[PDB]
Design a protein around this ligand. Sequence first.
Ligand SMILES: N=C(N)c1ccc(O[C@H]2CO[C@H]3[C@@H]2OC[C@H]3Oc2cccc(C(=N)N)c2)cc1
Ligand SMILES: [Ca+2]
Length: 223
Amino acid sequence: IVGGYTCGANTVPYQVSLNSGYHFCGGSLINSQWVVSAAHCYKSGIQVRLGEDNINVVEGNEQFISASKSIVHPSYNSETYNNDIMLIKLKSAASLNSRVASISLPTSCASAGTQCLISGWGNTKSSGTSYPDVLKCLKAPILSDSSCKSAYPGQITSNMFCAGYLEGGKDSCQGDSGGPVVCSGKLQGIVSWGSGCAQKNKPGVYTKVCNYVSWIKQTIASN
Ligand SMILES: N=C(N)c1ccc(O[C@H]2CO[C@H]3[C@@H]2OC[C@H]3Oc2cccc(C(=N)N)c2)cc1
Ligand SMILES: [Ca+2]
């Protein structure tokens, strides 16, 4: 997260870290057994880490649970990141508490200008590299589809939206991928892609979760 702030420990209790010996992507807990992330974060051997603030220090509210299965969206395209969403099942149910909590799925899509909260353990610099160990947060509005498509001609599908600030300075970044975009209490986006981080006229691009609620619900009920 570039241009954000320190969230405060466990104030985003649905935020998970995906760990394969090290943090490599964010995710969102959507019930006691399932996490939503980006398909481009797929790998084997995932451990889900819940209740995290400092991902390098055991602070006493963590739950580390291995994934028992992963399901990449059937139509995920790795070249374009169209349909950049995946579900991960926990081998055992998480113990839900005030620091480890699910986020609701949308009942409808969010409209432009709606404010959201984006969070993650990604790079905090727009040039060069610095990784925080505590969770970072950013408030950012959904941008109009026109501004989105203009910044990225021929690349935005109906499954993508942009959020952020055209002037630059504030964005998600590498290592934030898979993490949540929450607008009015609902998981409306997933950190997906962009151009650099926090560059002018290049806002972040996010998986449009509302389009996937039927697939999510049907997939978790059958697995
Ligand atoms: N539809 C396209 N033509 C497209 C889609 C994804 C794509 O993935 C690339 C570009 O962005 C991804 C990846 O390589 C770098 C990584 O950057 C990210 C990741 C996550 C967040 C951000 C951000 N600044 N908000 C940037 C490239 C082209
Ligand atoms: Ca920790």
